[PDB]
Ligand binder design. Structure first.
Ligand SMILES: O=c1[nH]c(=O)c2nn[nH]c2[nH]1
Ligand SMILES: O=c1[nH]c(=O)c2nn[nH]c2[nH]1
Ligand SMILES: O=c1[nH]c(=O)c2nn[nH]c2[nH]1
Ligand SMILES: O=c1[nH]c(=O)c2nn[nH]c2[nH]1
Ligand code: NA
Ligand code: NA
Ligand code: NA
Ligand code: NA
Ligand SMILES: [Xe]
Ligand SMILES: [Xe]
Ligand SMILES: [Xe]
Ligand SMILES: [Xe]
Ligand SMILES: [Xe]
Ligand SMILES: [Xe]
Ligand SMILES: [Xe]
Ligand SMILES: [Xe]
Lengths: 295, 295, 295, 295
């Protein structure tokens, strides 16, 4: 037998950082969960019980805190690239670092129509994520995403004209509820190293904001022919607005809300045009994915 | 042996309702999870296998949908009171209904600075809840709550002057992070029946909004001496603003963020005045409760 | 305004203890999650920012570890009683301690038909719990429970003869699936103090084992007329086998498995006597409770 | 823009099947959660709102139930292969099916030392899984796994001799607790089609049992030099016992249990040789992966 692939590291490292403006008194907080996995010339730890090649996962944890102390933690694309580069440069035998960051929302509170200097609210479990792969001699690959963005529209969604055969019971519809949890990932062109990532720093927050805005507007305004068709429109627009993105991937559940026929009870009308009360279905759910790239 | 207490019913009944304004085109959605448990002269179903006394839990489910079709579902205090009253009036042998409602957020989207007519976002997992106990001959008891409101302040929290003995290692502090998930419940004076609940309908949404506003403002502005002291201030203010409330209860975790001493690494300073990077602790957590009533 | 009730303490304190037999080499592990909440003359911490009355929750955490070091942690009824008594005796102004313990399963592994001396498996998320209320001058109240015991029977469950009215769609049945998650609590007679709890130590594990055995056997063997009827049989038997128990409470979800009519597809028969494939329902669920005491 | 990849289908489809032996009266239950995603000539549903190419996800759900009615559901490798083959054969324009199955435990109850004919218990949340990829013209690729197997050993684990630099605080140890949740996947050689999968049916359950037994025995008996070294031993043995497996992958968290220094309290000794009470850490955790193949 032989080791074909190996990676190891520390997962679920929770980190909080505060920035304090001494001039204005304003404080800004960041909170993340970080995972770092390393690869390189480490086979002997598996095959020969040779621990000399192991950077302890505990040390990886310490390194995350030290790096956060000495560097900006935002945008997360930059912090991830700094952290990954550290490992491949510091250790001769480590040749790849894989850094995953989940950013948690701490939104500044408005109290009496004024932004508060040091108080924050978690407005939704929506996350902003990065995956950064730093590979020695091959640069830095960054995938940025948003996830956990949960939306619903109560009309202006249709689904008709699908394949009908002996397995089909679904009725065609011209008016249904559409609800999903959005997972959207944009993959950046490969960067040569940290200097190049630094050169593009302003594009990271701007592209996240664009991806979010395009997703929300398209969902709200499209008279949707299917999840497939609406999601493609979203992806097309993001690619048009940021030339440094190579691909956009969406993964969308279709969270079903069923009509409830109440006609058995005193002829109560609650279907089609008369539908007011629906039963949200926890499971099963449709799952629709697509990756869109350039011609 | 004897049956000392019994209740039974249906839990986790998900309900969605849409309201459509034909004049303006504007749609408004409501989504809830409902639980209804009944009590009354039902001992024989347990002791003698006498099912004749059982209103099937499946029928309770049907009743929830029918009631939602024929009545407003907002404010939830009213809907809960309608639903509970139905069971005690319809069935001679049922003498109490216990209705729990969890309301999920569907907040209207703003697209280009304008409210969208039929598109919604789940902004946070904060819930608005009601517990309604309808007891034949004893009226209607309503507890209203908000839960899952997660906040953090990065300064203006202190904790010093506590008891120190041979079990104590905690250092006194004049500047710490304070973060909690707010669970706040206000208990209404007993109502004689549905007519009285209906007479107070406007107070329910207004009191929820007040409870939320008082909680956020007090948390943000108090130079907190402890969770105990800040929470009492919140409760006192709610009782002052709504005379129909008898008690206010808060249950608050203290979600700890620990300093990380980095001095072992090149004398890096990250404690006290120099603290920037902290480690959020998943567990354990402080838990602080209080119920405040009138003199 | 006035403080009507208050309690505070530490929740989610994870504890592991190992016992090592030097003679045999055999090791035994215990793992628990502990919550301790205190009450007493502490109103001034809320109303006057008087921290002098506060035993810090951090100190409560330390006390749990110290107590576990110096005392047996099994049975949990005993450990809980020791821990609660400590607080009311040590602090003059603390008059009640409320101790909740959840015990996690670590079952010794069998390797080649022999019990292994130091290796363990988590066989199910079933828990054994205690709630211990130690109140100065009023003794020790103990509720013991098992929870998270998930069972299913594929036949020998019936449900017919229930109330039928204009809200009823449920068909009577003489053969259905019955599945539940068992939550069963037995409440001990009040104990005068620690000496009395110690005198009954052997009864705690034996009564837990009896409660579990009675639950499983009755579920498996009863040709069930309803959840109500089967659960009563369980409770009656536990009360008969342990005279020091005052009441037994069961709380049981009815986790529904629905028939799937496939007759629309080539006349495939999958209902009634021909039912083979079913759809487990995540929600809603029946919820049936009962508390059984002595005549 | 262009569609680079697309797949869509139904997730979270819960299925239960019962088998009834008329001769012996014995019943056996199976419960699974199934996901099926399809690929093929479906780009136009995304780009042109052409639904004619869409097999509705609702129809995919129906197909899962029908297939379960007409075929054995065990071993899951076979059921998955049947289900995936159905889609690629039935629909000319569908060229790949991806089937994920999670099997839930329903273990027959022993009542008074005898196996019960129709009563079952969920003994642990350990799962047996399959991933089956059926690709037109390229055969059937099957990955089988077990997950959620949670174990702990209280001694006979060591970790010393790792890299020490200015980022390292971890002390070397010759005696520690080792606890993990096992995720182990074995990848079968490619099968040419359903006939070949059928020819190997007995190997699927036997290889699952072997993988489980090897994992448990190796964990219990190895005087572990690291997670890396012990996991490699497991993988090597599985590959030796089943020639039709090409690779074995393990993914293992290192769930840390920390010593608690109690010496500040009356010189209480609870570290090193004297350690009895430990603090389980919820996060962070080590994460160690390896894929082992043949020379
Ligand atoms: O078994 C271990 N492997 C590792 O890589 C490691 N790093 N810290 N502790 C560890 N334990
Ligand atoms: O056992 C049952 N008890 C009930 O009260 C009930 N209601 N519907 N189905 C039921 N099954
Ligand atoms: O606000 C606090 N209240 C308390 O009771 C406490 N105990 N430790 N830290 C604390 N912080
Ligand atoms: O938008 C949809 N896309 C689909 O593929 C589908 N299948 N059923 N309902 C559906 N809705
Ligand atoms: Na390197
Ligand atoms: Na009545
Ligand atoms: Na006392
Ligand atoms: Na095909
Ligand atoms: Xe951070
Ligand atoms: Xe969508
Ligand atoms: Xe609703
Ligand atoms: Xe607070
Ligand atoms: Xe313990
Ligand atoms: Xe039951
Ligand atoms: Xe199944
Ligand atoms: Xe391991």
């Amino acid at each position: 037998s032989a080791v074909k692939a190996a990676r190891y590291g520390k997962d679920n490292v929770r980190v909080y950082k505060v920035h304090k403006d001494e001039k204005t008194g304003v404080q800004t907080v960041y909170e993340m969960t970080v995972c770092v996995l390393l690869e390189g010339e480490i086979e002997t730890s598996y095959t020969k019980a040779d621990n000399s090649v192991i950077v302890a996962t505990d040390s990886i944890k310490n390194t995350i805190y030290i790096t956060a102390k000495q560097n900006p933690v935002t945008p997360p694309e930059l912090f991830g690239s700094i952290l990954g580069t550290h490992f491949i440069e510091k250790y001769n035998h480590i040749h790849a670092a894989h850094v995953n960051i989940v950013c948690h929302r701490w939104t500044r509170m408005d109290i009496d129509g004024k932004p508060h200097p040091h108080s924050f609210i978690r407005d939704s479990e929506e996350k902003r994520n990065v995956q950064v792969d730093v590979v020695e001699g091959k640069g830095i690959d960054i995938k940025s995403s948003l996830s956990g963005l949960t939306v619903l529209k109560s009309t202006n969604s249709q689904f008709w004209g699908f394949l009908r055969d002996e397995y089909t019971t679904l009725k065609e519809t011209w008016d249904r509820i559409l609800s999903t949890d959005v997972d959207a990932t944009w993959q950046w062109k490969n960067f040569s190293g940290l200097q190049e990532v630094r050169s593009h720093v302003p594009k990271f927050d701007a592209t996240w904001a664009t991806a979010r805005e395009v997703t929300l507007k398209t969902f709200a305004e499209d008279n949707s022919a299917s999840v497939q068709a609406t999601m493609y429109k979203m992806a097309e627009q993001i690619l048009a607005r940021q030339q440094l993105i190579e691909t956009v991937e969406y993964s969308l559940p279709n969270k079903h809300y069923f009509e409830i026929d109440l006609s058995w009870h005193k002829g109560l009308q609650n279907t089609g045009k008369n539908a007011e009360v629906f039963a949200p279905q926890s499971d099963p759910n449709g799952l629709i994915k697509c990756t869109v790239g350039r011609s």
